[PDB]
């Protein structure tokens, strides 16, 4: 029922790994000698990269929890939060319990609204996406895989390293028994170029849906991005290159009339700061 | 046990230097000998963490053979003296274990400076990983 | 018997090996575009007189394959072991070297590998609002790297270069049937000359769909019906390639189908001589 | 097409046997012969011994011309009954000297079959005639072309307009458990479901009284409720079917939900090889009627007792994911005497094929072999593709050695040295070595191999390096290392080292054979 | 009738690795049945350019009632909530469960800007397609890297994580290795010289949307970013097919991007065609 | 069950060394900038090991306020090879004994493992502090 199209707010920018960044994926593919904890690297270049699933998942899981806490007062702002209660469905094996975290993936519980009509009003699944039997609300954001910036390509050409091997150890409290290991993590300070496209489907609710994306990002700068994380290995920081609106009249004609917002030297918390009405003011003229 | 480390090593060392070039045989021989290479390195300790700088040095230009550069001069320089620096930093009981591992690769490195770059170093790098892989299977890592 | 072979080097995967009637309907719909309406009925009168084409047959890197005659089955015991008497009969295609031998009833050899592979690809149907799947199967002929499909032509060359060689350049860019909006029937064309020696005798194998007027001698029967401009054609009893007629010219049956023009169905035989056993 | 799931195929395979008896019993009454004059009748192929009068040959041309013209209108040349006869002498039966007269008299008769199968519809005379009839359409189930208005709505949905001859085969598809035989009677009778080429067949139900002049009785030789005036014609048929919660025949979508491990439909189609060369060994009508009846009763009667779960002394242990249930979920679609086609739960059809072959190898005294071509297809798959792929997996396992089973769709090099389908004895030791060390039973793995199901995919990745390059020995150390890191150095000692005996024999390396033995263990777990 | 065939060629650059699958590594990409090279179907690229151009019209069902007829007979939205074909709403063809825009006849499909180009069956009419989206295979540079020992697929293991207990639930996805090159070919058919213009503007509009969206696969997790690099525009006139004498109109777009080809070069490169029509 | 979120108390500051420091014979350094640095694991795994030892002596004073301290006696599983028993240090990592409560609701009640995080078999309770480099 009624899917439309008005443009695509494109968020261009650069992810700056302030602390060592770690993602991790498979190893030993026709290969013997490694450190056995390698960050995912694409095969054509052999350089590390931030995936889209590792960024869309961590922007999601930091925005289930914000909703899970303020579930009580947002039923008036957003309908279909009255189907839910704060908590997990884990103590009793139900795919639809009274609580919020309702869908069993394999053995874990992830909030996904079961219908198109239920997910249309839900703040989480209207943005990040949903699924079900026969109803299936699809997403709006396309989080794309982030690769190193023009500069950090050349530091792989000039000879500078990009991955470091940190040795961590475990210690018994009694016999001081050293239990060591090694990690491959991204060198601290490397910088990946991300891009997050927001498919504007309804002009009624994009202001309260861009603000939710900049809420999940502003939590991610205080939390970590994948990896061991609680011991420093995350600490990621968004550096916005350009917001661009990419309207509907752009795609037919080809005129460079796409609305460009000013995000030169601003924090992710400064966009959502009082001035979000002023940064995206000229988007209101196009609706 | 260690009595196999005395006989099988002295059976293999005259076969080692007599095939000093890395392009000896692309057939079943270089894999059949490579199990015997790790067979007398089994009874020795042969820790890999000192070799991790050498193998990552072999790793970082293995992509650079693959349309990165056509020059393995700067890499194979760095592999020769660091492998001499292996006994050149680490001595002791691990030195008698690492002297026997020195005498196989050092005849093959000197080929690789004047060798082809797409060829004859892949024939080394395949003999590189044959030594490591069986060594994990006989009980060492 | 020097035959103008027409090689069809495929780009995308064919829906089928084109039957002889799939080609002539494809060629007639080409000439109704690149030559107007009156040249197609002129094309039909040319095939009535002398001109004949054949069904399409595969080829695998110049090794041109041809249909096995049904002349070999009643006396395959007179040819040549029981395992050989079945695997030689089970076959469907013979090589250009081995097709000439079975016309003379010589011992021969089947090919070892067939060039094409009829694979079935699953596709999906997605609604635009909810991205909800709706699977359906689909299957098509998938050809190899060198290989492809060809067919034959024997007749006056002023009818060839005037009609067919334009049509096989227009049909290189719209397919020979199938879902040719998914790039299925498309190809590129090159023409050649090809020679098959026929022993002079009154029996003949047909290299196209026979649709006989009198009953043939030994025939592998075939039921198919086409689709002209969204209108179903009735199922007709063609004979498959490699059946034996004696002095039969075949025919074409025009059909009504409620179109503005009449619609012909190619069933003119393509006789090459054969030696039959006693029966 | 994708209609009529398995109540309909099981109806066709008994509908074909009705036409097979409606001709043979027509020859016996019209010529004055009893049922002793049938030598055999199994699998769409019969043989009747009769007299040589001028009077009978007038009758046999009437039987043949009336059968074929029925088989042309009712089926648009999809089925043909090629009847041939040949006069013999009395001395032609027994062997004379050292020359088998009865074989060469059978070669005079089988060649008249081979010519008649070529001239496929000769006795029609309206065969190649053309008459364009207004507005025909085709059936959605079986694809027969009928005029419009004859297409009537179905028994499933009133939306689709199926053949009239399909609704008689869906209604018969429900009356299969409620059945005790058929009654052969005249065409214009009440209560006849299906018509043959000479007569009509009334169902003789569970509770009911038999009607007609001749009564076909399935799977029993005793005239239980049959009148004294009637003729008793016993036919056997392989008839096992898993009953649903109702009183009826199972579905495609019931068998695979109740399978072991993941859900899939396990089709097998196998046949006895070199059997036509075997029946030429016989040299008298006493000898051929026996050999065509003991071979007949295996796939008719004794295949039921295998699926019921018997004969452990004769069979032994088979490659089996779990021990045999009390009520197994197996649907015998067709089993003819030389041939069979059995669907079921896809990890019991896997168990059954080694259980049929083992019992067949002791029914025969080790002399004849099977060639079973196993496929594994999803429930959402039309049957005309399932029979198409499995019969091609059959001829894959037929042209190679005729004593070999196809198990899984498996990738091979383009050399020709590597043949796909497993030999029977060669496979059942690959189960004895590889399976009880990586598999324990009932869809679970051995100790401390759980949370390492990624390993067995990686171990089947190293098999995919052997296929792009057979000459490479990259698979030898990657086998040894991956067992080292995971701590599993004890498993697979045959794969860690090269075999110098296998190189000189020009046979596949032991990493080539491991694909099919791993996948069955892997697919039996949820994977 | 027939006038000529504007054949578009060029390159598809799968900038981010893409995945299609066969449903038979848990989700393997499609490959050839013989060589094993992955490819893009013609259907996965015709239907994807159909979905993206369908939605844009869906927004403009009002404003295109004077440029195109047969959009006054539509209202925006689906017809899923009432299983009623050719109702007032736009997506009015239920194939199995999916509701797709397909026009039902000829004389409304001739004016509808999707079904005119991409084609529509309906009942009693069957207006065929006008474009022919031929398959895309890897460039001979990448066919050779297949022979040069490089792997052209790579498994990415994604995981699914419990919110409270932070358990791990992995899965595998075999994608095409990022950075690859596919060579595509889209063969338009010039049936009517009246609306000759708009079908090339409405096809390149769908590629402006496909370059910002994804091309199949997971996509929103990052597996699209297909990019179009054009190499040749042609015309192949009706004069060419009769004789074969090579006088076809060629437009050079060797370094032209898909937004630099719509208006930046569309009056420029197709200036030579407009005199011949 | 029921993970929630009210905010994130941020503790900034500056570690000072009045006497010379060592980490680990070079002190490990930031590669891109060359400077030495105190890691995250050496500051979170050091506070845990000076708090699991502090809780070990006091299992009578905290047990009235914290549940799931009654499930352990103050001790060590180093002599007796048992996973979960009366002794307080329960996880053998490979060879070392670190106190990790093996469940969510044990770690929800534990004073250590509600703060420095806790693994488990199908429980895996996650931490509440994140200590950066
Ligand atoms: Zn939701
Ligand atoms: Zn029917
Ligand atoms: Zn339309
Ligand atoms: Zn604790």
From Swiss-Prot, chain C:
Swiss-Prot/TrEMBL keywords: Antiviral defense, RNA-binding
Spans through the membrane: none
Coiled coil: none
InterPro entries, alphabetized: Csm4
Record-level GO BP terms: defense response to virus
MF terms in GO: RNA binding
Family, per entry: Belongs to the CRISPR-associated Csm4 family.
Role, per record: CRISPR (clustered regularly interspaced short palindromic repeat) is an adaptive immune system that provides protection against mobile genetic elements (viruses, transposable elements and conjugative plasmids). CRISPR clusters contain spacers, sequences complementary to antecedent mobile elements, and target invading nucleic acids. CRISPR clusters are transcribed and processed into CRISPR RNA (crRNA). The subunit probably binds to the 5' handle of the crRNA, helping in discrimination between self- and non-self.
Subunit structure: Probably part of the Csm effector complex, that includes Cas10, Csm2, Csm3, Csm4, Csm5 and mature crRNA. Interacts with Cas10 (csm1).
Miscellaneous section: Encoded in a type III-A CRISPR locus.
Name under which the protein is recorded: CRISPR system Cms protein Csm4
Organism the protein comes from: Thermococcus onnurineus (strain NA1)
Gene that encodes it: csm4
Curated annotation (Swiss-Prot), chain D:
Domain comment as written in the entry: The N-terminal HD domain has ssDNase activity. The C-terminal GGDEF domain has the cOA synthesis activity.
Family (UniProt): Belongs to the CRISPR-associated Cas10/Csm1 family.
Enzyme Commission numbers on file: 3.1.-.-, 2.7.7.-
GO MF annotations in UniProt: ATP binding; endonuclease activity; exonuclease activity; identical protein binding; transferase activity
Cofactor note: Ni(2+) and Mn(2+), but not Mg(2+), Ca(2+), Zn(2+), Co(2+), or Cu(2+), is required for ssDNase activity.
Keyword Kinase: no
Further remarks about this protein from its record: Encoded in a type III-A CRISPR locus.
Protein origin, superkingdom: Archaea
Subunit organization: Probably part of the Csm effector complex, that includes Cas10, Csm2, Csm3, Csm4, Csm5 and mature crRNA. Will form a homodimer in solution, interacts with Csm4, which is a tighter, better association than the homodimeric Cas10 and uses the same interface for interaction.
Entry's Gene Ontology BP terms: defense response to virus
Activity regulation information from UniProt: ssDNase activity is inhibited by EDTA.
Cofactor annotation: a divalent metal cation
Shown residues in whole-protein numbering: 251 to 777 of 777
Source species of the chain: Thermococcus onnurineus (strain NA1)
Keywords per UniProt: Antiviral defense, ATP-binding, Endonuclease, Exonuclease, Hydrolase, Nuclease, Nucleotide-binding, Transferase
Domain GGDEF per the UniProt entry, residue ranges: 263-410
Name used for this protein in its record: CRISPR system single-strand-specific deoxyribonuclease Cas10/Csm1 (subtype III-A)
């Amino acid at each position: 029922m009624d899917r439309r199209f008005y443009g695509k707010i494109v968020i261009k920018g650069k992810i700056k790994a302030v602390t060592g960044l770690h993602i991790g994926s498979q190893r030993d593919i026709s290969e013997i000698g490694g450190i056995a904890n390698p960050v995912i690297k694409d095969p054509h270049t052999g350089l590390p990269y931030i995936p889209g699933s590792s960024l869309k998942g961590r922007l999601r899981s930091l925005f289930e929890i914000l909703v899970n806490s303020r579930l009580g007062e947002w039923r008036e702002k957003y309908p279909s939060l009255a189907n839910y209660s704060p908590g997990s469905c884990r103590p009793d094996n139900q795919e639809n319990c009274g609580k919020f975290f309702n869908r069993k993936i394999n053995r874990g519980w992830i909030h996904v609204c079961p219908d198109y009509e239920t997910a249309l009003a839900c703040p989480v699944c209207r943005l990040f996406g949903a699924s079900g039997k026969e109803s299936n609300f699809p997403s709006r954001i396309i989080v794309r895989d982030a690769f190193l910036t023009k500069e950090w390509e050349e530091k792989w050409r000039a000879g500078e390293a990009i991955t470091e091997a940190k040795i961590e150890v475990g210690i018994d409290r009694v016999t001081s028994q050293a239990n060591p290991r090694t990690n491959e993590r991204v060198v601290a300070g490397a910088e990946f170029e991300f891009e997050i496209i927001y498919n504007v489907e309804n002009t009624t609710h994009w202001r309260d849906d861009i603000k939710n994306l900049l809420t999940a990002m502003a939590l991610l700068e205080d939390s970590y991005l994948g990896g061991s994380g609680s011991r420093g290995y995350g600490k990621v920081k968004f550096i916005f290159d350009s917001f661009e609106f990419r309207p509907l009249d752009y795609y037919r004609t080809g005129k460079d009339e796409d609305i460009v917002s000013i995000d030169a030297r601003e924090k992710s918390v400064s966009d959502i700061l009082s001035g979000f009405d002023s940064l995206f003011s000229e988007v209101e003229g196009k609706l | 046990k260690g009595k196999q480390w005395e006989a099988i090593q002295p059976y293999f060392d005259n076969v080692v230097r007599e095939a000093k070039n890395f392009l000896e045989w692309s057939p079943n021989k270089r894999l059949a000998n490579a199990v015997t290479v790790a067979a007398y390195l089994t009874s020795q300790g042969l820790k890999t963490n000192q070799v991790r700088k050498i193998l990552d040095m072999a790793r970082t230009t293995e992509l650079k053979v693959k349309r990165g550069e056509g020059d393995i001069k700067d890499d194979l320089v760095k592999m020769r003296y660091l492998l001499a620096y292996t006994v050149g930093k680490a001595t002791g009981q691990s030195k008698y274990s690492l002297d026997a591992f020195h005498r196989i690769l050092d005849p093959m490195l000197e080929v690789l400076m004047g060798s082809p770059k797409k060829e004859n170093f892949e024939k080394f790098y395949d003999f590189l990983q044959a030594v490591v892989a069986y060594h994990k299977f006989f009980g060492g890592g | 018997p020097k035959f103008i072979a027409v090689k069809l080097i495929p780009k995308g995967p064919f829906r089928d090996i084109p039957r002889a009637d799939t080609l002539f309907g494809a060629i007639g719909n080409a000439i109704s575009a690149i030559h107007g309406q009156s040249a197609v009925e002129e094309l039909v009168d040319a095939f009535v007189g002398g001109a004949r084409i054949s069904s399409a047959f595969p080829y695998s890197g110049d090794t041109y394959y041809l249909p096995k005659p049904l002349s070999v089955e009643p006396a395959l015991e007179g040819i040549l072991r029981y395992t050989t008497a079945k695997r030689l009969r089970k076959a469907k295609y013979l090589d250009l070297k081995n097709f000439e031998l079975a016309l003379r009833l010589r011992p021969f050899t089947i090919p070892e590998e067939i060039p094409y592979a009829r694979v079935d690809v699953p596709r999906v149907v997605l609604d635009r609002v909810t991205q909800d799947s709706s699977i359906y199967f689909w299957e098509e002929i998938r050809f190899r790297e060198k290989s492809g499909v060809y067919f034959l032509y024997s007749g006056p060359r002023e009818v060839f270069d005037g009609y067919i060689a334009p049509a096989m350049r227009f049909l290189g860019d719209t397919g020979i049937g199938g879902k040719s909006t998914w790039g299925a029937g498309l190809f590129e064309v090159e023409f050649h000359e090809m020679k098959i020696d026929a022993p002079g005798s009154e029996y003949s194998v047909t290299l196209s769909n026979a649709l006989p007027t009198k009953t043939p001698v030994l025939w592998r029967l075939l039921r198919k019906g086409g689709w002209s401009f969204g209108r179903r054609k009735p199922r007709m009893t063609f004979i498959a390639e490699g059946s034996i007629v004696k002095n039969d010219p075949g025919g074409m049956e025009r059909l009504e189908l409620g179109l503005s023009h009449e619609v012909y169905v190619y069933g003119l035989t393509f006789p090459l001589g054969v030696e039959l056993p006693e029966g | 097409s994708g209609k009529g799931t398995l109540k309909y195929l099981r109806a066709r395979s008994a509908y074909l046997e009705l036409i097979g008896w409606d001709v043979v019993l027509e020859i016996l009454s019209r010529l004055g012969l009893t049922r002793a004059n049938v030598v055999f009748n199994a699998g769409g192929h019969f043989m009747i011994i009769a007299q040589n009068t001028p009077d009978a040959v007038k009758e046999l041309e009437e039987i043949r011309a009336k059968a074929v013209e029925w088989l042309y209108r009712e089926f648009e040349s999809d089925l043909y009954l090629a009847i041939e006869w040949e006069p013999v002498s009395g001395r032609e039966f027994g062997r004379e000297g050292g020359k088998n007269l009865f074989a060469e008299a059978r070669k005079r008769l089988k060649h008249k079959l081979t010519v008649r199968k070529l001239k496929r519809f000769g006795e029609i005379k309206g065969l190649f005639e053309h008459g364009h009839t207004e507005r025909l359409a085709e059936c959605p189930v079986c694809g027969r072309e009928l005029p419009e208005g004859k297409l009537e709505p179905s028994a499933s949905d009133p939306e689709t307009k199926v053949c009239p001859t399909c609704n008689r085969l869906v209604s018969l598809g429900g009356n299969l458990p409620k059945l005790l035989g058929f009654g052969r009677t005249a065409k214009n009778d009440a209560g006849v479901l299906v018509e043959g080429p000479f007569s009509g067949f009334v169902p003789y139900l569970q509770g009911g009284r038999p009607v007609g002049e001749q009564i076909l009785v399935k799977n029993t030789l005793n005239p239980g409720e049959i009148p004294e005036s009637a003729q008793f014609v016993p036919y056997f048929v392989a008839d096992y079917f898993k009953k649903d919660p109702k009183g009826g025949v199972a579905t495609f979508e019931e068998l695979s939900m109740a399978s072991t491990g993941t859900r899939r439909l396990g089709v097998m189609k196998g046949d006895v090889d070199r059997l036509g060369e075997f029946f030429s060994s016989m040299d008298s009508p006493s000898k051929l009627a026996t050999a065509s009846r003991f071979m007949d009763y295996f796939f008719k009667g004794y295949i039921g007792a295998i699926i019921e779960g018997k004969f452990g002394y004769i069979i032994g242990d088979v490659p089996s994911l779990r021990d045999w249930p009390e009520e197994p979920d197996i649907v015998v679609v067709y089993a003819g005497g030389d041939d069979f086609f059995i669907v079921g739960a896809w990890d019991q059809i896997f168990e059954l094929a080694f259980r049929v072959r083992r019992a067949f190898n002791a029914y025969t005294g080790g002399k004849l072999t099977l060639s079973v071509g196993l496929g594994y297809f999803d429930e959402r798959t039309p049957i005309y593709r399932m029979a198409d792929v499995v019969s091609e997996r059959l001829d894959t396992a037929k042209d190679e050695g005729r004593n070999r089973v196809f198990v899984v769709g498996r990738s091979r090099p383009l050399d020709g040295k590597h043949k796909l389908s497993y030999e029977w004895n060669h496979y059942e030791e690959l189960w004895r070595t590889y399976a009880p060390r990586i598999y324990a039973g009932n869809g679970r793995l051995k100790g401390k191999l759980e949370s390492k199901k990624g390993l067995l995919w990686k171990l089947l990745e190293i098999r995919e390096l052997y296929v792009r390059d057979p000459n490479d020995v990259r698979w030898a150390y990657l086998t040894a290392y991956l067992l080292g890191r995971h701590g599993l150095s004890d498993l697979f000692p045959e794969l860690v080292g090269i075999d110098t005996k296998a190189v000189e024999r020009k046979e596949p390396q032991p990493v080539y054979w491991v694909d099919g033995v791993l996948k069955i263990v892997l697919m039996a777990v949820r994977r």
